[PDB]
Amino acid sequence: MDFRIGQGYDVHQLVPGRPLIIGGVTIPYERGLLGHSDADVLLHAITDALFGAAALGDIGRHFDSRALLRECASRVAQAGFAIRNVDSTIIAQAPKLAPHIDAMRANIAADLDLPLDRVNVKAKTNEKLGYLGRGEGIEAQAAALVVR
Amino acid sequence: MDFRIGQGYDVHQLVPGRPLIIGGVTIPYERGLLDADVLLHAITDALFGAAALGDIGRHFSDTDPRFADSRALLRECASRVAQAGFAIRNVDSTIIAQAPKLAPHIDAMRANIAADLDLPLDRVNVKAKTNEKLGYLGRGEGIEAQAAALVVR
Amino acid sequence: MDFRIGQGYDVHQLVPGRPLIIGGVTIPYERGLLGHSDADVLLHAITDALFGAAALGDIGRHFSDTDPRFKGADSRALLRECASRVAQAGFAIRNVDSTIIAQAPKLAPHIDAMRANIAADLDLPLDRVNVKAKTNEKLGYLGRGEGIEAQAAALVVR
Numbered sequence: 167m168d169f170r171i172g173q174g175y176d177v178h179q180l181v182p183g184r185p186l187i188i189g190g191v192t193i194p195y196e197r198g199l200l201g202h203s204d205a206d207v208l209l210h211a212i213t214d215a216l217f218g219a220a221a222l223g224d225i226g227r228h229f230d231s232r233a234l235l236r237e238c239a240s241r242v243a244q245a246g247f248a249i250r251n252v253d254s255t256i257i258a259q260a261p262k263l264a265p266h267i268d269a270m271r272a273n274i275a276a277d278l279d280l281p282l283d284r285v286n287v288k289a290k291t292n293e294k295l296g297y298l299g300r301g302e303g304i305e306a307q308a309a310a311l312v313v314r
Numbered sequence: 315m316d317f318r319i320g321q322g323y324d325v326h327q328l329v330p331g332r333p334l335i336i337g338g339v340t341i342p343y344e345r346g347l348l349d350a351d352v353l354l355h356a357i358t359d360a361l362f363g364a365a366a367l368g369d370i371g372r373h374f375s376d377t378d379p380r381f382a383d384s385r386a387l388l389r390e391c392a393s394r395v396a397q398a399g400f401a402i403r404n405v406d407s408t409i410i411a412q413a414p415k416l417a418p419h420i421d422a423m424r425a426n427i428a429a430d431l432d433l434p435l436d437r438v439n440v441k442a443k444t445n446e447k448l449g450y451l452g453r454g455e456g457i458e459a460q461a462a463a464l465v466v467r
Numbered sequence: 468m469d470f471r472i473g474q475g476y477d478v479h480q481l482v483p484g485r486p487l488i489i490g491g492v493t494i495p496y497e498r499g500l501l502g503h504s505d506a507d508v509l510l511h512a513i514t515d516a517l518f519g520a521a522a523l524g525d526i527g528r529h530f531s532d533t534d535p536r537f538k539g540a541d542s543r544a545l546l547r548e549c550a551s552r553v554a555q556a557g558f559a560i561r562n563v564d565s566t567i568i569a570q571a572p573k574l575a576p577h578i579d580a581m582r583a584n585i586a587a588d589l590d591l592p593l594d595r596v597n598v599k600a601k602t603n604e605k606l607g608y609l610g611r612g613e614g615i616e617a618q619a620a621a622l623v624v625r
């Protein structure tokens with residue numbers, strides 16, 4: 167069977183006067199992520215990981231973030247691949263993310279037409295190190311397994 | 315078959331006053347991590363990720379009365395993975411540290427992790443990098459670990 | 468069905484007076500990557516992912532930055548030797564995915580050429596090789612153009 171892996175990375179700046187939206191979840195917070203889209207860093211990383219596993223290039227070449235994630239899933243099926251699983255990590259010093267994880271996972275599973283058991287989201291701080299540790303941005307990493 | 319992938323990430327600050335333990339191995343150095351075993355946490359997270367069981371924070375709470383060092387957590391991680399129905403196929407990882415030289419300690423880390431995961435030694439890999447003097451990592455202010463894991467249901 | 472995954476990371480400083488070589492592509496630029504070999508950050512990251520999947524250690528060990536024979540070494544030759552060792556250990560490569568993170572220059576015009584180089588070196592079709600390019604959204608040493616980072620993932624089978 168023809169399995170493929172993909173990995174994705176994203177980061178966005180935390181700025182005043184934007185809502186904080188991660189994995190489709192709006193999180194109460196003084197700042198939000200800056201981007202041309204809704205800057206959903208988690209969804210962007212998953213999107214890149216899915217495009218990478220299908221060898222379809224990247225999000226910058228192809229393109230709210232859930233609509234884009236749905237379009238990615240479409241283009242991935244279009245190339246003849248089915249999604250097996252997604253795993254990810256959010257790196258954010260603040261705010262606390264644990265209470266929103268299940269919602270993110272629910273959002274992603276719905277967007278990718280996957281059961282909850284094939285979608286995972288993990289949260290981490292950066293132990294006060296670098297721009298992430300100073301709360302200047304939020305990073306997401308993703309890994310996706312697909313099969314043709 | 316029903317294969318799944320997971321990925322893991324971890325970082326800790328590097329300062330005088332603590333031992334340096336990476337992958338179960340105490341390494342002589344003028345600094346240490348605030349056991350704070352970056353490599354084992356990353357691998358733990360990667361395993362929980364592949365299993366879709368959340369993350370290290372949800373399983374082993376920083377307050378929970380039952381928690382032990384990072385090898386014990388790794389061992390526990392692996393039993394939870396097994397019970398969800400998953401066999402571990404392989405782990406690969408990278409440690410990024412500007413100093414000390416990590417190459418000498420890799421075989422011991424691979425041995426500890428393989429022991430802890432009940433894996434054949436040739437299914438466990440650890441790699442070493444510096445940050446080429448860039449950022450907090452390159453200034454020796456912290457050490458990062460990265461992990462990938464493949465499992466099967 | 469004996470599948471294995473590997474992952475890779477690399478970063479090099481971006482300095483004046485060096486060629487900029489990423490994915491085997493020499494990119495016109497006033498700066499280039501600093502290292503012992505040609506400093507091709509993307510190929511090193513993929514090489515690490517491949518050694519990692521086969522559990523063969525790492526590129527720093529197979530191709531040491533302290534060994535003079537690798538001075539100015541062609542990282543495509545290094546990737547091809549890696550692939551040869553991975554094959555020798557019994558693995559076939561199934562796919563590679565990767566990311567390059569750089570403030571500058573624009574990498575989109577060069578991505579297809581990089582993909583082509585990697586596919587050639589690994590004896591893979593283009594449809595099993597992927598290279599993604601981003602910026603770091605102006606953040607950190609990458610945002611300041613002090614270095615270029617690459618990340619990689621590889622799937623192999625014994």
Ligand SMILES: OCc1cn2ccsc2n1
Nearest residue numbers: 210225226229601602604
């Ligand atoms: O680098 C942040 C970023 C750029 N980009 C383009 C499409 S989605 C997206 N995220």
Ligand SMILES: OCc1cn2ccsc2n1
Nearest residue numbers: 291293324325355370371
């Ligand atoms: O980011 C450092 C860190 C946080 N955390 C929570 C459980 S194990 C662990 N390492």
Ligand SMILES: OCc1cn2ccsc2n1
Nearest residue numbers: 444511526527530531532
């Ligand atoms: O850390 C940058 C680096 C060192 N090294 C040794 C062989 S390939 C390579 N890239």
Ligand SMILES: [Cl-]
Nearest residue numbers: 602603605610
């Ligand atoms: Cl940037």
Ligand SMILES: [K+]
Nearest residue numbers: 305323458616
């Ligand atoms: K990083």
Ligand SMILES: [Zn+2]
Nearest residue numbers: 176206207210
């Ligand atoms: Zn983004």
Ligand SMILES: [Zn+2]
Nearest residue numbers: 324351352355
């Ligand atoms: Zn940790």
Ligand SMILES: [Zn+2]
Nearest residue numbers: 477507508511
């Ligand atoms: Zn390198």
